Design a protein around this motif. Structure first.
Motif, PDB file in Angstrom:
ATOM      1  N   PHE A   4      13.793  -8.759  12.083  1.00 54.84           N
ATOM      2  CA  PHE A   4      13.816  -7.841  13.626  1.00 54.84           C
ATOM      3  C   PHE A   4      14.563  -6.632  13.268  1.00 54.84           C
ATOM      4  O   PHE A   4      14.325  -5.732  12.588  1.00 54.84           O
ATOM      5  N   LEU A   5      14.365  -5.987  14.320  1.00 52.30           N
ATOM      6  CA  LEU A   5      14.820  -4.773  14.557  1.00 52.30           C
ATOM      7  C   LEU A   5      15.842  -3.970  14.543  1.00 52.30           C
ATOM      8  O   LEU A   5      17.660  -4.657  14.659  1.00 52.30           O
ATOM      9  N   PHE A   6      15.988  -3.652  13.687  1.00 50.02           N
ATOM     10  CA  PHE A   6      16.780  -2.548  13.448  1.00 50.02           C
ATOM     11  C   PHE A   6      16.986  -1.215  13.380  1.00 50.02           C
ATOM     12  O   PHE A   6      15.879  -0.554  12.594  1.00 50.02           O
ATOM     13  N   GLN A   7      17.760   0.068  13.518  1.00 44.00           N
ATOM     14  CA  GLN A   7      17.853   1.234  13.605  1.00 44.00           C
ATOM     15  C   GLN A   7      15.981   1.786  14.501  1.00 44.00           C
ATOM     16  O   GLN A   7      15.559   2.682  14.512  1.00 44.00           O
ATOM     17  N   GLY A   8      15.862   0.686  15.226  1.00 41.81           N
ATOM     18  CA  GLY A   8      14.701   0.996  15.168  1.00 41.81           C
ATOM     19  C   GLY A   8      13.077   0.657  14.594  1.00 41.81           C
ATOM     20  O   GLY A   8      12.051   0.894  14.637  1.00 41.81           O
ATOM     21  N   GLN A   9      13.440   0.225  13.136  1.00 39.21           N
ATOM     22  CA  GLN A   9      12.479  -0.049  12.389  1.00 39.21           C
ATOM     23  C   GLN A   9      12.718  -1.954  11.724  1.00 39.21           C
ATOM     24  O   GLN A   9      13.332  -2.168  12.046  1.00 39.21           O
ATOM     25  N   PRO A  10      11.565  -1.808  11.860  1.00 40.14           N
ATOM     26  CA  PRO A  10      11.186  -3.547  11.261  1.00 40.14           C
ATOM     27  C   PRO A  10      11.787  -3.817  10.049  1.00 40.14           C
ATOM     28  O   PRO A  10      11.628  -2.900   8.953  1.00 40.14           O
ATOM     29  N   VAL A  11      12.210  -5.238   9.311  1.00 38.04           N
ATOM     30  CA  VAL A  11      12.827  -5.536   8.408  1.00 38.04           C
ATOM     31  C   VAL A  11      13.213  -6.897   8.138  1.00 38.04           C
ATOM     32  O   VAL A  11      13.371  -7.272   9.456  1.00 38.04           O
ATOM     33  N   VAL A  12      12.168  -7.477   7.402  1.00 36.70           N
ATOM     34  CA  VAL A  12      12.568  -9.194   7.119  1.00 36.70           C
ATOM     35  C   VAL A  12      13.808  -9.351   6.511  1.00 36.70           C
ATOM     36  O   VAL A  12      14.388  -8.715   6.152  1.00 36.70           O
ATOM     37  N   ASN A  13      13.488 -11.418   6.847  1.00 41.70           N
ATOM     38  CA  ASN A  13      14.972 -10.754   6.857  1.00 41.70           C
ATOM     39  C   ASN A  13      15.192 -12.405   5.774  1.00 41.70           C
ATOM     40  O   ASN A  13      14.743 -13.160   5.741  1.00 41.70           O
ATOM     41  N   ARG A  14      16.087 -12.504   4.976  1.00 44.57           N
ATOM     42  CA  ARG A  14      15.576 -12.371   3.779  1.00 44.57           C
ATOM     43  C   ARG A  14      16.694 -12.446   2.327  1.00 44.57           C
ATOM     44  O   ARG A  14      17.360 -11.202   2.602  1.00 44.57           O
ATOM     45  N   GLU A 101      15.002   0.273   4.806  1.00 44.67           N
ATOM     46  CA  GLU A 101      13.776  -0.518   4.981  1.00 44.67           C
ATOM     47  C   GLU A 101      13.044   0.367   3.173  1.00 44.67           C
ATOM     48  O   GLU A 101      12.963  -1.144   2.679  1.00 44.67           O
ATOM     49  N   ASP A 102      13.456   0.962   2.795  1.00 51.76           N
ATOM     50  CA  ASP A 102      12.314   1.423   1.536  1.00 51.76           C
ATOM     51  C   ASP A 102      13.390   0.326   0.505  1.00 51.76           C
ATOM     52  O   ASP A 102      12.407   0.376  -0.674  1.00 51.76           O
ATOM     53  N   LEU A 103      14.181   0.316   0.375  1.00 54.08           N
ATOM     54  CA  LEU A 103      15.871  -0.814  -0.492  1.00 54.08           C
ATOM     55  C   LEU A 103      14.407  -2.308  -0.843  1.00 54.08           C
ATOM     56  O   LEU A 103      14.316  -2.333  -2.051  1.00 54.08           O
ATOM     57  N   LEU A 104      13.467  -2.648   0.376  1.00 54.28           N
ATOM     58  CA  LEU A 104      12.972  -3.981   0.004  1.00 54.28           C
ATOM     59  C   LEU A 104      11.054  -3.734  -0.091  1.00 54.28           C
ATOM     60  O   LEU A 104      10.664  -4.301  -0.601  1.00 54.28           O
ATOM     61  N   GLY A 105      11.361  -2.148  -0.572  1.00 52.78           N
ATOM     62  CA  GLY A 105      10.151  -1.642  -1.018  1.00 52.78           C
ATOM     63  C   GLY A 105       8.984  -1.741  -0.503  1.00 52.78           C
ATOM     64  O   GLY A 105       7.900  -2.139  -0.482  1.00 52.78           O
ATOM     65  N   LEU A 106       9.352  -1.349   1.150  1.00 54.86           N
ATOM     66  CA  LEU A 106       8.916  -0.485   2.524  1.00 54.86           C
ATOM     67  C   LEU A 106       8.332   0.209   2.659  1.00 54.86           C
ATOM     68  O   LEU A 106       6.824   1.317   3.334  1.00 54.86           O
ATOM     69  N   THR A 107       8.489   1.933   0.991  1.00 55.43           N
ATOM     70  CA  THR A 107       7.773   3.254   1.180  1.00 55.43           C
ATOM     71  C   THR A 107       6.573   2.837   0.088  1.00 55.43           C
ATOM     72  O   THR A 107       5.593   3.906  -0.237  1.00 55.43           O
ATOM     73  N   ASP A 108       5.353   1.505   0.464  1.00 52.52           N
ATOM     74  CA  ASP A 108       4.612   1.263  -0.577  1.00 52.52           C
ATOM     75  C   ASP A 108       2.968   1.403   1.713  1.00 52.52           C
ATOM     76  O   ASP A 108       3.807   0.552   2.190  1.00 52.52           O
ATOM     77  N   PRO A 109       1.657   1.584   0.939  1.00 55.82           N
ATOM     78  CA  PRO A 109       0.592   2.215   1.695  1.00 55.82           C
ATOM     79  C   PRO A 109       0.708  -0.413   2.061  1.00 55.82           C
ATOM     80  O   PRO A 109      -0.653  -0.157   2.291  1.00 55.82           O
TER      81      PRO A 109
END
Length: 114
Positions: A4-14, A101-109
């Protein structure tokens, strides 16, 4: 997959995993208090003075166990229904867009979950 769109950033729902609980307490650090207090309004299931007893009960390990199990408090309520959406809403209060976003581990390439 399902984001879903959150704060203009993509994030998986789970449902968050042990990684998210560990990375959370290890990422928010001092914000652990803010995220918990912000989630009170976002989720009526955690609105209660849980943070009060959470800090005192988890005062042994510190901010680590404090926020670690704090993330499970929401999953314990339902777990199947409990989605990252609620957690993200708590970070949206302290302006933790990158932390959400980084919480889910989105800080990776690449990413993390799937």
């Amino acid at each position: 997959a399902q984001t879903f769109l959150f704060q203009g950033q993509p994030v998986v729902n789970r449902p968050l995993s042990l990684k998210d609980q560990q990375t959370f307490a290890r990422s928010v650090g001092l914000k652990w208090r803010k995220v918990g207090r912000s989630l009170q309004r976002g989720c009526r299931a955690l609105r209660d003075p849980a943070l009060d007893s959470l800090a005192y009960e988890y005062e042994r390990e510190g901010l680590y166990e404090q926020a670690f199990q704090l993330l499970r408090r929401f999953v314990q309520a339902e777990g199947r229904r409990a989605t990252l959406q609620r957690l993200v809403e708590a970070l949206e209060e302290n302006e933790l867009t990158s932390l959400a976003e980084d919480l889910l581990g989105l800080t990776d390439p690449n990413g993390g979950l799937a």
